[PDB]
Amino acid sequence: SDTIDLADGNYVVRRGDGWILSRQNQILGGSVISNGSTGIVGDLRVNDNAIPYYYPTPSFNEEYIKNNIQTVFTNFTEANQIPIGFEFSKTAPSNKNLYMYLQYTYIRYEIIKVLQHEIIERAVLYVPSLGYVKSIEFNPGEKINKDFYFLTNDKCILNEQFLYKKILE
């Protein structure tokens, strides 16, 4: 639930790497390879595609979240100004068709207010990190599950973390 074993106060939290956002699965397109061909897809995280997403709360506005997160954790305002590229490479089996689509992954940061061992307020920051592809073998006309294309709620493809530090007054 929303109950945590922490003393009262404000905390900065790193939830880990590999967070993909809802409805943002095929925002970048995909490749269709077949019959032994190798498909390679890559991207470059610079500025406008490295925009961090803020979700503030009345206690924790943008400046608060940014300053706290950058003080304790990776400094993203200067890091996202440095272009980082990445690539994926899949190889389709013989006489079969494979579709691969790529989406951005993010770092999840949280600013939480804890009172009586329960979180009463939480603000969320997403910092662009890298990408991730999902691939499926398909035939012409085959129905494809809705879960492959569409993500309903933000989830972490990796192990979620909880790296917390108490915010000093």
């Binding site: 929303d2 956002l21 809802s22 409805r23 943002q24 699965n25 095929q26 925002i27 970048l28 397109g29 995909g30 490749s31 269709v32 390879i33 077949s34 019959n35 032994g36 061909s37 190798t38 498909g39 390679i40 897809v41 890559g42 991207d43 470059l44 610079v46 406008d48 595609n49 979700y55 503030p56 709360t57 009345p58 490479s89 579709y99 689509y101 790529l102 979180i119 009463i120 307020e121 939480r122 603000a123 969320v124 499926i136 398909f138 006309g141 085959e142 129905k143 494809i144 809705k146 294309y149 569409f150 309903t152 709620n153 933000d154």
Partner: protein, 421 residues
């Protein structure tokens, strides 16, 4: 001989799949002839703030390219610039024996923006977002075999990617959004402000405790619609208060577009989710309120559906009522009062049936007690489509028929209440 679309009135964005290419090789990147034992690759690199997409529209003034891009951003948060920074590359090594050919095509992702109103598409726009290509590999075509004369296949598109149709409703941008800053307890009354001034609008709100809620306007007028914000509540949270993620993508839950039908909504709402309530155009300056009441009684046996309030059931004979038919496995409710004086012994023979859409119906006797409304089942598994069966009901009593549509043959559902005796 098309399909019936049970979409509520509004704006919808449809992801029709990936891997679309134009006919007559208009998107042909090219063909590489790799010798035996060698390797080959086709690379399609892209620049910054480039990559022209493909856009057509039925009404440029309303569905302009800027408008379509903003709606696409509302639905899936796509931006053309995102496709600019991408690269794709196809690598193929030919075997030792024979040569190999590889053909590369630039692909597109097909998005469609539709203005759905009363069972038809009044405005349609097609957007094609540059995708990450399509590659097909063949054995080396031995020159020459023959050359066979063929004709062009005219303008059109060919999808090489998997089948896909993801439909997402989006908030109408022209309609205002008012926020309820406080989470909803067991009871609340929203007074519609004069700022919007009779124009249809949305109410964004959340719920304190998960449960089944009755939402209605004054005298159940006008009919209200409810949507759920997709992916809401996973982000920034505050206990007992509303946190707007500015999510425009919505899922239609229930509601009637017809502003004159007396109706109230019974819906299961989640404290970890955000919801919108669309109230339509009101043609008067007369005040109105939205009432929110958490239900703990038998009314929870109506979720999730709009209950339609029938007033013209005051005589024997033929009566039928037309509403926007819900989708398959989606519910619609009717609350009606048999004509005559209620003396607990006078009965009238009632026939309930639908005209085109088949649905399974369950009717309830309603006896309002001092604890609230009490719903008593008196029949189950009623097949409404051309139902010839009749049941005797008490004159002056109140009944609620909940219908689950099991076959959609018409955009509208017609419930007939025939009264003899």
């Amino acid at each position: 001989t098309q399909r019936v679309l049970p979409y509520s009135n509004g704006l919808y964005v449809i992801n029709k799949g990936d891997g679309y290419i134009r006919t007559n090789d208009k998107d042909l990147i090219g063909t590489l002839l790799i010798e035996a034992g060698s390797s080959g690759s086709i690379i399609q690199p892209r620049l910054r703030n480039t990559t022209r997409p493909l856009f057509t529209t039925s009404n440029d003034t309303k569905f302009s390219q800027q408008y379509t891009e903003e709606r696409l951003k509302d639905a899936f948060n796509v931006q053309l610039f995102n496709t600019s920074t991408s690269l794709f590359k196809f690598v193929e090594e030919a075997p030792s024996d024979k040569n190999i050919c590889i053909k590369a095509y630039n692909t597109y992702e097909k998005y469609e923006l539709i203005d759905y109103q009363n069972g038809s598409i009044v405005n349609k726009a097609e957007y094609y977002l540059p995708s990450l290509g399509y590659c097909e590999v063949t054995n080396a075509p031995s020159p020459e075999s023959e050359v066979v004369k063929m004709q062009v296949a005219e303008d059109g598109f060919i999808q090489n990617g998997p089948e896909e149709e993801i439909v997402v409703g989006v908030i109408d941008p022209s309609e205002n959004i008012q926020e309820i800053n406080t989470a909803i307890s067991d009871n609340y009354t929203y007074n519609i402000p004069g700022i919007v001034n009779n124009n249809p609008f949305y109410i964004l709100f959340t719920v304190n405790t998960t449960g089944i809620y009755k939402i209605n306007a004054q005298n159940n007028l006008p009919s209200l619609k409810i949507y759920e914000a997709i992916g809401s509540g996973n982000r920034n949270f505050q206990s007992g208060n509303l946190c707007d993620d500015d999510i425009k993508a919505i899922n239609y839950i229930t509601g009637f577009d017809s502003p004159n039908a007396k109706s109230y909504l019974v819906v299961l709402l989640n404290k970890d989710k955000n919801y919108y309530i669309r109230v339509p155009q009101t043609s008067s300056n007369i005040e109105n309120q939205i009432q929110f009441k958490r239900e703990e009684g038998d009314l929870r046996n109506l979720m999730n559906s709009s209950v339609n309030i029938i007033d013209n059931l005051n005589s024997t004979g033929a009566h039928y009522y037309t509403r926007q038919s819900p989708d398959v496995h989606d519910y619609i409710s009717y609350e009606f009062t048999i004509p005559g004086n209620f003396n607990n012994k006078d009965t009238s023979n009632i026939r309930l049936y639908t005209s085109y859409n088949q649905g399974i119906g369950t009717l309830f006797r309603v006896t309002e007690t001092i604890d609230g409304y009490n719903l008593i089942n008196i029949q189950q598994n009623l097949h409404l489509l051309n139902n010839t069966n009749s049941i005797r009901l008490l004159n002056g009593a109140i009944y609620i028929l909940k219908v689950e549509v099991t076959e959609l043959n018409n955009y509208n559902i017609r419930l007939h209440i025939d009264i003899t005796n």
